[PDB]
Each structure stands twice: as C-alpha cells, then as structure tokens.
C-alpha cells in the first residue's frame, strides 16, 4: 500500500509442505558448535545467481531459473562456505517482480525435491510439486521458503549436495498492453536470506579453490591487454553485426571453467608463433624452402592428439613472413635473422599441413646460402592476402576443431577486441583489423583460477574509470566470448578505458539492455 | 534497516568540554543536500552510482554555516528520499548505507543489497525516511578536517522500464532531503574561522568586460563559443583548479602573463649578427629550477614570432633607457635553439647598424606577433616536456566557451586575422588561487546573469579542472554580451544535463 | 635495543624448549574500534633474539631454527559492522597463479621463458627497468601489465634524410595505445627496453610514391650506453636509421616499434 | 589481573558427537562391546610411520581413516557386526632420542573434504 497500485499487492498461497527440522539433526553429528552471525540473518541479500529477465519472446514451457539449495545463494554464505565443510539448509527467498500495470503473465515457483531427474520440467508439472504461482505485475516482494528434504544429516559443501531446488517457469508469457514500441522485458532480481535454522557443521581451512566462489575479472584496463590472437595491444573493443557472428577462430578462447579449448596458449608470447626443428634441403631456381617439424614451443614435442595444431598456431589464412634466428649462415656477412614467407592458406599447393607438423616456409633469394638445422623459433610479421577464416590444417582433410562461437540470442552480437596487425599491400590500404573474443589477460586468468560455473552466462558491468556510470552491460557466456545486445547495424566502438566488472551468473536467456 | 544503535552524543559528551544545541527549528525542516540530485533515465543500464552522500554538516546549508564556529560534531542525520514518478513506471532502487572505511573501487548490483539497505521503488507515493547514523571510530568528528564517515550510496536495481513519449525520455528525477535528528549536536565552540572546508565557491561580481585576460595582457572583448574550433585545446596560461592549485605556466597576476624576466647577453655581430641570449629566471626576483611548470611563470604559450620590448643600459649614444623590437621565434620553426624549459631563449635584435648593447637583468613585455596559431610552443628543442593536461572530457552535447581578446600583430594579408582564447580569466585565476576552496563535486553549476535586467543569458557548468562548459548543439559561432556576473548554484555532478543555448 | 625489550610484558622462550608458549595480544588502543581496511597501528609483537644461540655437533656452518606462529581470537574478538565480501582486501590471500615458468611470458623481451637459472658468477644486484613489480598495484620502472608491450614502443615517426648516409627517423615515443607521453618519473614509456646495443626494429610504414607496395621497413636503432648522436627516450625523441642507397618517401603518421634482433647484447642500463 | 599463563597443557576441545543416539532407532542391535577394550591403547593395524631428514618440508606422513581397523580387537570384532558408530583416541609414539629438532602437526580432517593436497 506504498505506491498507487492497479497491481496485485499481495501473494500468500500457502505452499503445502511440512516444515523440516534441520540443525537439530546434525548437531550431534558434528563435533563442533557453529553459529553463523545474528546479523547475517534478518538481512535480505541478493544471491549470486538467478537474475532473470522475462521477455515476450519466451515460450511458456521455458525455465527462468533453477536454484539448488545451498550456501551459494548469498555472498555471505558463499563466503563462509569457503571455510566449512557441510551445511544444513533453510532459506527465505524473495522474488522481486517488476513491470508496470501494462504487463501481464504468471510465473510458477516449484520446490522440486532432490531426487528428481534434471531433464523435462514441462508446463504441466505444476500440480505435482509444492508450488506458488505469482503474477508478474506484483508490487510486494514475494517471500517463499526454500527448505531441504534430505536423507542425510548434512550436505557436504563440495560437489555432494543433491538437494532441493526452486524451478521457476513462466506459466503465461508476458503480453503487454502498452500502445507503443517499448521494451517491457520484465527484469527481476531475486534475493535470499538464511532462516533461523541454517548453520554449518564442521570447520575446515579456507582453500580459495572452492566451488561457488565469487568469480572476478582482472581489473587492468581493456587497452592494457595483450590480444590473444596476434601479439599486439588491443586497438579498440567494438561490435559489428555485419561481420559473421558465428566465427570458427581457434586461438583466444577458453571455457571459464578453466579449460583451454582450441589452440590457445596461456601467454601473449606463445600465441601465433612457431618453434620447430628446421630442415633446409631443397635448392633450385624457385627460391629456397624450409621444412620444419613443429613442437610445443618448449622442450616438449608435438604429438597431435586433439589440439588441432601446436598451442599458438596462426589460425588465419594469409602469406605471413615469419622471421627466425636461422642459425649461423656459414661464411661471411653472417646475419642471423631471416624472413621466410609462408602461404599457410586453405590447402595451398602440396603438404603444408600443421596438424602433423612440417609446414613449408620459403623465400625467393638468388644467393644459395647454407643454414644449420636446429630448434628454430619464428615470430610472425606482415601478413599478405589476409582472410579471417580457418586455414585447412590436415591438408584439406577434417581436423578436431574448437566449436564456433555458438548460440546467441537473436538480438545479440559478440564483443570483438580489435587490433591492427602488420601487413603488406599492393594498394594503399590500411586497418587490417584482427579481432578476438577474449584478451590474453582473461585467458591466462581463467586458465589459472579455474572457477566453478553454476549457470551458463555471467553479467559484466563495463565502467570507464573517469566520468564513469556504466558504458554498457554484457553477459559473458561460458565458452569464452562476450555477447552484447546490439540490435542495430554498423560497427559501434566503445572507449578502451573500462573495467570489466562482474555481477552474477545468469542463464542463456537473459535480456540485456540495448546499446547505442 | 538492521543497525540497532543506542547512543551517539552521550558517548562523546564526557570528553567534549561543552556540547551545544542548535535550535529546535533546524531539526524540523528537510533542506536538500548539495549534490544528491539524481535522474533515472530508462536508457540507464542498472548498477550505476546515483549518489554517494557522506555524513557531516555539509549536508545542510545551516549545519555547514553554523559548523564554522565549533570545533566538531556528533550525531545522526536523517534523509527523506523523494522521487518524481507517478504510476505506470516500475523499477526498484536501493539506498545502501555504506560504513566508514569502505573502499570505493567498484560497487555492482550484488554489492548494494548486502549492506543494511532500504529497497524502495520508483512507484512509491509517500517519501522515504531513512536514518544516517554515524558509526564513529572516535568520540567526536572534527569539523575542519574531512573524515571517513558513514556514506549513503544509492543505486538503481531492476531498472526503470516505463513508456516514454515523443522526444522526451521520461527521467524519474529524485532528490535527497537531509535533516539532523535529536542526537546531532556540536562540540566546543571556537569562534574565529574565516576560511572553512564547507564554504561555497563564489565567483565575484566583476564584469567579464572589466576583467583582464589570462593569456594575453588585453581586456576581454568577446565571450563566445565555437563548435568548429577544436573542443579539446591544450592551453598553458589561464589553467587553474577550483582548489587553487595552478596548472602549468599560469601566474597569479594580470601583468606577468606572456612575459618573462631573464638575464640578458648581447654578444654576436659579425656581418649578419643581431642576436641576444636570455637566461630565464622568474618575474619576482627568484631562480628557475626546471620541474613541472614547463617554462617560467607567465611565459607566452603560443606559436608565433613575438616581438618583445626590453630595458637596456646602453653605454653609448643614449641613456640607460631605450627599447627595441626583439623578434623572438616562439613557433615550431627551430632555427635557433629555443628552450624555455632549461631557460635559454634566443632573440634577433634589430635591423640595426652594428651593435651597442649591455647585458643585465631584463623583463620582456610583448607587443606584436607575426602569425598566430593555437598550438603549444616548443619548450625544449621539440622534445616533450611536463605540461598541463588538455581540457578534459566533456559531455558530448557540450563545448567550452572562450573569452576573446585581440592581439596586435603584423600581417600585411588581412586585418584582425586572429583572436586569443581562454577560460576562467585572470580575475578568476587570482580569485581561486587566493581563496583556495575545498571542492565537493567535479562540476559546478553557474548562471550567467546580466546586471540591469536580470535576464538569465545562459547556464553553464564549471568543471574542477578549471574550464567552463556550455551545451550548445550546433556548428556555428555564437557570442554573448559581456555584462553578466557569473553566479553559482550548486556542486552538480559530472554527468549533468544543463538545458541548452539557443 | 637489548635492555629495552624487557621493559614490556614479555616471555623469554628457550630455543631448545618443548610444547609451546602463550602470549595475549590485547589492543591497548585509543580509538573505539579498528578499521580493517586502513593501516592504523595496533598492539604489536617485537620478538627479539635475546641471547645469541650456538651449536656444537651441527657446528660446521650453522643450524637454522624454524618457528611458527599460531594465533586464536581469545574470547573477546568482534567485528563491528557487516559488509559485502569484497575481493580486493588487505588480508585476503597472496596466492600466485597456477602456471609453470614454461608456458609463461617473459618480462624483459617478447619470447618464451626457456629456463629457471641460478648464476652466482657475477655481482647480482642488477638495475632493470621493465619486468619488476611489487606485490601491489604499483609498477616500479618501465613495466607494462601486458606481454606485448615489452621491448616495444609506439611512436609518431618522422623520416628525414634522402639516403646519403642512410635515412633517419624520429619517433617521439607515445605510450602504446595510451595517451601523450608527458615525461614524469618513469624514465621511459611503459614498454621501452632496458638492455643495450644495436636494436633492430621492424616498422609498419606507408611507403607510397607510386602505388605498387606497402612495406615493413625493418631498420636498426642505436640504443646502448655510449650512443652516436642524440639518444634521449626520457623526454622522448629516438633516432633510428636505415642503411639505404635510394629512399622513396614514407607517409609518417603513427607506428609501433617491435624488435627482431640485437647486435651486441650488453645487459646494463641503456 | 588475569596473569595469562603461557605454556599451557595442550588439548583439543570440540564436543561429544553421537552418544550412539542418532543411530539408535534405525539399527536393531546397538551392540555394546567389552568395556576392557576401551582402556588399552593397542597398536593399530596400519600404524608404523617414519620421518626422515631427506624426506621433504611439507609432505603427508600418513593418513589414518576412522574405523575398526584402528584396533586389532575392533578389526577382529568387525568380521561380524556389519556396522559401527563411535569415537576413538589415537596415541602417537615417537622415537626421536632427544636430539632431532622437528615438529609434526597431526590433524583430524573432516569427511567430504577434497583429498588432494594439504
């Protein structure tokens, strides 16, 4: 009764479940006494999950969030659960539904039990579970319990819970009554507190590798970063829907679980470079060549199992001149740097495969100089005939590649980090414009920390650190690419002075604010 | 809101000397804070700072005014948050109550609602009452030192999703209204304090046509703004802060500008001859140690061929008084080794017969240029030099207004070919560096107010890097009549939308 | 000193002792509570070697005596507000990244690390500029936070001579996609190299007199301790020369200077 | 004053955990066993560790479970008696011979803890 309301101000539908008596069960089990705090209680606080944006472009059999009961529903309990093992659970969860009196629609909560399959939760599974349906227009915060119905005394705080869940499904999808072209994507931020019965059972030391810890991105700048596909500083983060936004580029991508899919190294010097045992055999009037057997750019050797290339191979078809140490030109004018051309390309002439190793470089020179073989190491320079595609690795045959930058929502384009590599042009062209999905300081961050991903995406605030206030928001999907919501046309560039913050894990189906 | 206090004035009442009441009428008005005026536009992605307002007596005009005669204060403030939004505009907003000694590096949406906050709404009808009770670390706060007190951080949350009309995006404009509670009372009364950290910047009532230019010794003739000129210049004279800290070569004098004092040397005359070497010092009897000033104080900062007068103690054919031309290349053309950063400038003497000159301490006032460009002169051999930074980032609808004077020059091509530009002239530079105000915001609103009619000519914001911006959407020059005294209103924040100029 | 340590509440601990000892640390402070974010001082423990310890049977060189400190909050500790758990705190953890020195970037030259090494054959107090940090957000020296700026510098090139004694550039040394350089207390831009010798830099240029080609000019640069003429990167105008017989023009807007080789490596300051 | 004594008698206080009261209604037999077993420290069937100067600075010497294979009488009774509850006490005898200078932390780690590396 605070504001003026054409909306349902009250929902209390008496969810039919017996109250569980936790924490009087696991008190004789654990050999400790562990209160938490009496002020972590009575303080509603936003979970690091479940920020759900209902949209009109959602079917009514579609899930908004699926929260497993655990200490990963507050910053407080997910912070304390880095110490402890085990917890005994109760929560009060408030959904905060928003949207004007011009919206419509319902949404069902469902306290689905622990030992239920995580497959089909259809529209018709609302009468089976202890549920509360809730109008979208509602003004109060919707309080509802989230209790555990378990067969053990306490749930271990690592991957051993198998506990009770809240499933929300939009039961009637969001038709608006407004006579305008206004985006009524109802943004709801739910928020949970522990009850007077939540406690932790046993106290172990904090290890910081814990599951559901607060994920974070490195706070440097975006222009202070090494580009994860060409060794250059990032000369501009941007979006452009005119470019093909399902690219198959290999290097620069990493799951934020912490696995390096593709040909991606953990370093800004290991990327797009060679190290190889050289061989200088052929010599005729068509220049001189260099067949070199590739290795893993260290004391290891390249045995190809699944990496599709050695870690740090140039995955773009061109005619790049590597330059290399060339190892002691024999007699007179001993200049030990040499630029070998390389038409890496799609299946260029004969046997320039990198998947087995032994790519063929060459240079046209009349003086038949002799070069000592050995473990040479080649950096790139001045690509020619640049084409931002996948070069044919196994000489035209198939190759185990990384999957492309995959499922976008239909009003989403990927943020591309854009630098300008060196080039050779017959015309007086410019701005050769290479663009990756992540910088190297995110790849070597995510490969090092090895976070635990609860949901798929995670929101990222972008804040320039002078005259600030939120340039854009964007959800980083858990395959290594930032996707905005730019439903326009043409390249929109952002200033490279902004910290990438973090908000929370959201599902794949979060509606971002349109930029422009 | 979960805080649960018990006392906030009886704790410090033992070790205070005397605690002092204010009156029972200041505890009854909600008078608004200086810098907590926010506006939630629908095109704002959620998670941005609306306001970060501390505790203190600098939340009312009355407490800031009365707190100049006490030595400190304790007690709890109270906040009425009001919002200018009726129904059909949903979207929450949280007022978090952040403690003292909490670092300001980042505050995302999962961080606001983790304090003892209040989650209010845009659709609310009654205003929003909220305590701001000081969590001390000490007994009483002092009133002449800024101190880490409790701050009230507001941030939107499940953002504004409303229906907007044509060409007017529906901003929900919100205000904060502060009032001290019954716990608020000052401590020991110390009467004499003239300059205070809670004094308001004032900008005196001198006319802009009666004030001296801060880049060239001429009275200001015009007051105009050009979107065709570069909106980000790098000036080195007339740069100042509102703090009073000068920037670059700027003197606190109208007579020192574009001038320099040096020790002269008159050596060479061998057929083409006619050169002088000035070893720079300072214009009030000091030395020159090259630090960050990039030049001595008041050195001319523009590229041209400046002719400068001089005082000569010439032995033969005249007394110790004769002036001369002294062409001096300030420009990018480095024929002679021009370096004011080490303090050695070179100047061609005169189209003269041979030579009769004597060295000494001189001061070289300017009189004419040959060709003016608005680029910085070469201070050290063409190399770089510690400069005052360029004029900072504007709101993209704003351009800086500038204060025209006119040099006298040699052209022989066209008359009045150039004009000289500055922001905050020398009667404001010498004002700010003599009062030395304490700033709250980064911007500062002004209203240009003519005298004999009172017509508001324009409003304009004065950024704390010492330049006045003005929101003129256009691409043409336009002037303003130079008879309006600038007057402040409030410390507006950085991203403020001043209206327009037609 | 030796006498002043005993005028405090203190425990003298024998080094040969068994099952360890107990100290209270109760805050004799002047303020009400202590903020956990600032650096205000508290009840400290100076722990001082009182009598010098000796050894007989490990009396060949020495015998270090290890010791641990284990503390608990004895029944009066409270925290006096409640806050969101922020990451960048004072007392968090100083965990290092889980990466080998192989698969890792070098901090002096853009090339991978080929070995840990210990060299006690020289005076080991070098004065390096890039590649040294604190365990803090500060970056003392010319150090970048990125692995691609090191031994590299962005520039506004100006090419002058018509290839009589070669052709000479002038670079003016901006920060690598930063701003104007504005010389302060850094001694160079954020990635300028700190070794010595004839460093060869490959430069993206815009060579167009008649339109047939676009090259990377790839010319050398004197950088050692005793240079030839006018080598000043602290204010920033470096001169790099190409041995050219005939020089067509170069459109000179903005370049980035990356190395390919040195001719004579002296590991001293430049 | 409080006199705050240093070098106290070292102990591990936590709690009594069960009393065999949790497992009482769902066991059937709650078999008491031989009150003289409870009064003898008997050398456990795994036991038998050895520290060495050439070992490492930070290794795990041993990792005892909790179970009836910590007592040969309980290991012989656990051939029958398909379940068990209860607590134990472990006594760690060293042979240092008064000249070796070390220190070893013995720590009861809770279950469902990551078994990787302490």
Subunit partners of chain C (3 or more CB pairs within 8 A): A, B, D
Handedness of CA C199, C204, C208, C211 (dihedral sign): positive
Rg of chain B, C-alpha, whole Å: 28
Lookup: tokens for C268: 């001293």
What DSSP assignment string belongs to B360-408? -EEEE-EEEBSS-BSS---SSTTS---PPPPP-PPPTT-EE-EEEB---
CB A20 within 8 A of CB A148: yes
Burial class of A34 by CB neighbour count within 10 A (0 to 12, 13 to 18, 19+): middle
Cα separation, D75 vs D84, in Å, equals 11
- Across the interface, which of C98, C110, C145 has its CB nearest the CB of A231? C110
Note the helical H segments in C99-238.
none
CA distances from A85 to A25, A48, A88, A157, D114 (A): 16, 20, 11, 5, 10
Residues of B in contact with C33 (CB under 8 A): 137
CB-based contact (8 Å) between C133 and chain D? Answer: no
Q: How many residues comprise chain A?
A: 516
Cα separation, B432 vs B244, in Å, equals 5
CA of A116, closest CA in chain D: separation in Å? 23
CB-based contact (8 Å) between C23 and chain D? Answer: yes
Lookup: tokens for D101: 């200078």
State whether residue D74 is helix, strand or coil: helix
Of B75, B185, B70, nearest to B136 (Cα)? B75
Between strands C196-203 and C255-266, the pairing is antiparallel
DSSP state of A440: H
Q: After which residues is chain A broken (C to N over 2.5 A)?
A: none
Cα separation, B42 vs A513, in Å, equals 10
Q: Which residues pair with B77 in a beta bridge?
A: B132, B180
Chain center to CA of D16: 15
CB atoms within 10 A of CB A159: 10
CB A150 within 8 A of CB A114: yes
Lookup: tokens for A322: 């590597």
State whether residue A362 is helix, strand or coil: strand
What DSSP assignment string belongs to B189-222? E-----S-TTPPP---S--TTSSB-SSSSSB--E
Cα separation, A263 vs A252, in Å, equals 8
Phi-psi region of C13 (alpha: psi -120 to 50; beta: other; left: phi over 0): beta
Of B436, B343, B442, B437, nearest to B394 (Cα)? B442
What DSSP assignment string belongs to B239-270? -B-SSS-B-SS--S-SSSTT-EEEE------S
CB B108 within 8 A of CB B175: no
Residues 6+ apart with CB under 8 A from B78: B129, B130, B131, B132, B178, B179, B180, B181
CA of A404, closest CA in chain B: separation in Å? 29
Measure CA of the first residue to CA of the last residue in chain A; give whole Å: 37
Chain center to CA of A4: 42
Subunit partners of chain B (3 or more CB pairs within 8 A): A, C
CB-based contact (8 Å) between B158 and chain C? Answer: no
A7-10: list long-range contacts, CB under 8 Å, 24+ apart: A7/A101, A7/A135, A7/A137, A7/A138, A7/A139, A8/A135, A8/A137, A8/A138, A8/A139, A9/A138, A9/A139, A9/A140, A10/A138, A10/A140
Cα separation, A411 vs B280, in Å, equals 64
CA of B388, closest CA in chain C: separation in Å? 9
Chain center to CA of A333: 51
State whether residue A359 is helix, strand or coil: strand
Lookup: tokens for A434: 């290479």
For residue B120, which phi and psi values (nearest 5 degrees)?
-100, -175
Look up tokens 């929300």; give the residue: A168
DSSP state of A346: S
Cα separation, B200 vs A285, in Å, equals 84
CA of D13, closest CA in chain C: separation in Å? 14
Measure CA of the first residue to CA of the last residue in chain C; give whole Å: 44
CB B274 within 8 A of CB B350: yes
Residues of A in contact with C87 (CB under 8 A): 214, 216
CB B407 within 8 A of CB B369: yes
Tell me whether residues A75 and B47 touch, CB distance under 8 A: no
CB atoms within 10 A of CB B434: 9
Cα separation, A3 vs B209, in Å, equals 53
Tell me whether residues C21 and D7 touch, CB distance under 8 A: yes
Burial B286-308 (b: 16+ CB within 10 A, else e): eebebeebbbbbbbbbbbbbbbb
Handedness of CA A319, A325, A326, A332 (dihedral sign): positive
CB A403 within 8 A of CB A352: no
Lookup: tokens for B409: 């020059």
Lookup: tokens for A245: 């936004």
What DSSP assignment string belongs to A65-100? EEEESSSTTSHHHHHHTTT-EEEE-EEEEEE-----
Tell me whether residues A42 and B2 touch, CB distance under 8 A: yes
Burial A41-72 (b: 16+ CB within 10 A, else e): bebbbbbbbbbbbbbeebeeebebbbbbbbbb
Residues 6+ apart with CB under 8 A from D15: A30, A31, A32, A33
Of A277, A242, A281, A247, nearest to A262 (Cα)? A247
Residues of C in contact with D5 (CB under 8 A): 22
Range 51-90 of D in CB contact (< 8 A) with A: none
CB-based contact (8 Å) between C15 and chain D? Answer: no
Cα separation, A69 vs A77, in Å, equals 12
Look up tokens 């980032």; give the residue: B393
Cα separation, D20 vs C166, in Å, equals 94
Lookup: tokens for A185: 């994507």
Tell me whether residues A381 and C202 touch, CB distance under 8 A: yes
CB atoms within 10 A of CB C141: 16
- Across the interface, which of A29, A85, A86 has its CB nearest the CB of D17? A29
Note the helical H segments in A218-366.
none
State whether residue B110 is helix, strand or coil: helix
CB A101 within 8 A of CB A135: no
D39-44: list long-range contacts, CB under 8 Å, 24+ apart: D41/D89, D41/D91, D42/D71, D42/D72, D42/D73, D43/D72, D44/D69, D44/D70, D44/D71, D44/D72, D44/D90
Of A392, A236, A410, nearest to A313 (Cα)? A392
CB-based contact (8 Å) between D10 and chain C? Answer: yes
Cα separation, B128 vs B139, in Å, equals 30
Give the CA count within 13 Å in the CB-facing half-sphere of A318. 25
Task: State the Cα torsion A477-A481-A487-A489 to the nearest 10°.
Answer: -170
Burial A400-420 (b: 16+ CB within 10 A, else e): ebbebbeebbebbbbbbbbbb
CB A443 within 8 A of CB A434: no
Look up tokens 């004018």; give the residue: A333
For an interface test with B, which of A3, A49, A183, A502 has the most B Cβ atoms less than 10 Å from its Cβ? A3
Residues of B in contact with C32 (CB under 8 A): 136-139
For residue B463, which phi and psi values (nearest 5 degrees)?
-65, 150
Longest dimension (CA), chain C: 88
This structure's resolution (Å) is 3.5
Cα separation, A442 vs A266, in Å, equals 9
CA distances from D63 to A436, B3, C259, D108 (A): 48, 47, 54, 9
Cα separation, B65 vs B413, in Å, equals 59
For an interface test with B, which of A177, A467, A472, A503 has the most B Cβ atoms less than 10 Å from its Cβ? A467
Task: State the Cα torsion D13-D14-D20-D25 to the nearest 10°.
Answer: 160
Cα separation, B362 vs B324, in Å, equals 13
CA distances from B390 to B376, B394, C19, C181, C184 (A): 11, 12, 67, 13, 16
Lookup: tokens for A486: 């730019």
Residues 6+ apart with CB under 8 A from B282: B261, B288, B296, B297
Lookup: tokens for B388: 């005052």
Cα separation, D73 vs A73, in Å, equals 47
CA of A515, closest CA in chain B: separation in Å? 9
B53-56: list long-range contacts, CB under 8 Å, 24+ apart: B53/B151, B53/B152, B53/B176, B53/B178, B54/B149, B54/B150, B54/B151, B54/B152, B55/B132, B55/B134, B55/B141, B55/B149, B55/B150, B55/B151, B56/B141, B56/B147, B56/B149
Look up tokens 């914001």; give the residue: B461
Lookup: tokens for A163: 């506990």
Of A68, A21, A29, nearest to A49 (Cα)? A68
CB-based contact (8 Å) between C268 and chain B? Answer: no
Tell me whether residues A29 and D21 touch, CB distance under 8 A: no
State whether residue A186 is helix, strand or coil: strand
Cα separation, A103 vs A26, in Å, equals 46
State whether residue A505 is helix, strand or coil: strand
Burial class of B179 by CB neighbour count within 10 A (0 to 12, 13 to 18, 19+): buried
CB atoms within 10 A of CB C223: 23
- Residue B430 host element (H or E): helix B426-435
For an interface test with A, which of C147, C155, C218 has the most A Cβ atoms less than 10 Å from its Cβ? C147
Between strands B361-364 and B260-263, the pairing is antiparallel
């Amino acid at each position: 009764a605070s504001g003026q309301d054409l909306v349902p101000t009250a929902v209390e539908q008496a969810v039919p479940i017996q109250p569980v008596a936790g924490a009087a069960l696991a008190a004789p089990a654990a050999g400790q006494i562990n209160q938490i705090d009496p002020w972590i209680f009575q303080n509603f606080v936003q979970c690091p999950l479940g920020e759900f944006s209902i949209s009109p472009r959602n079917t009514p059999g579609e899930i908004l969030f699926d929260l497993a009961l655990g200490p990963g529903l507050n910053p407080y309990l997910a912070h304390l659960s880095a110490m402890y093992t085990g917890w005994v659970g109760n929560m009060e969860v408030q959904l905060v539904l928003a949207g004007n009196a011009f919206t419509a629609g319902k949404v069902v909560v469902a306290l689905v039990p622990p030992y239920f399959p995580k497959g089909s939760l259809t529209t018709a599974q609302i009468t089976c579970f202890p549920h509360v349906m809730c109008d979208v227009r509602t003004l109060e915060p919707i309080q509802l319990p989230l209790l555990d119905v378990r067969r053990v005394l306490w749930h271990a705080t690592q991957d051993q819970e198998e506990s009770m869940r809240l499933v929300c499904m939009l039961y009637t999808p969001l038709r608006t009554n407004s006579p305008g072209d206004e985006s009524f994507v109802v943004s709801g931020r739910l928020l949970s507190k522990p009850a007077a019965d939540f406690n932790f059972v046993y106290l172990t030391p904090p290890i910081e590798r814990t599951i559901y810890r607060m994920v974070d991105l490195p706070v440097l700048q975006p222009r202070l970063c090494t580009h994860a596909r060409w060794p250059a500083p990032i000369y501009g983060l941007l979006v452009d829907p005119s470019l093909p936004s399902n690219p198959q580029w290999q290097n620069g991508r990493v799951h934020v679980d912490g696995t390096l899919l593709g040909t991606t190294p953990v370093s800004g010097s290991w990327v797009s470079c060679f190290a190889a045992e050289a061989a200088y055999e052929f010599q005729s009037g068509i220049g001189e060549v260099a067949t070199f057997t590739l290795i893993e750019q260290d004391g290891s050797a390249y045995v190809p199992g699944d990496r599709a290339a050695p870690l740090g191979y140039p995955d773009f078809s061109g005619q790049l001149e590597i330059e290399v140490q060339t190892e002691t030109t024999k007699k007179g004018e001993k200049l030990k740097v040499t630029t070998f051309e390389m038409i890496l390309g799609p299946t260029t002439n004969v046997d320039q495969v990198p998947y087995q190793g032994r790519v063929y470089a060459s240079l046209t020179a009349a003086a038949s100089l002799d070069l000592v073989d050995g473990r040479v190491r080649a950096v790139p320079r001045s690509v020619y005939g640049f084409q931002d595609v996948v070069p044919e690795y196994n000489d035209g045959l198939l190759v185990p590649l990384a999957p492309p930058i995959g499922p976008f929502l239909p009003g989403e384009v990927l943020l591309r980090f854009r630098t300008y590599m060196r080039q050779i042009d017959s015309t007086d062209a410019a701005a050769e414009a290479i663009d990756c999905a992540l910088p190297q300081e995110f790849v070597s961050w995510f490969a090092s920390n090895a976070f635990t991903v609860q949901s798929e995406a995670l929101l990222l605030r972008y804040r320039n650190t002078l005259t600030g206030q939120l340039l854009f928001e964007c959800k980083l999907y858990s395959e290594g690419y930032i996707a905005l919501s730019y439903s326009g046309s043409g390249p929109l560039t952002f200033p490279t002075d902004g910290f990438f913050e973090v908000v929370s894990w959201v599902p794949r189906l979060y509606q971002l604010a349109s930029v422009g």
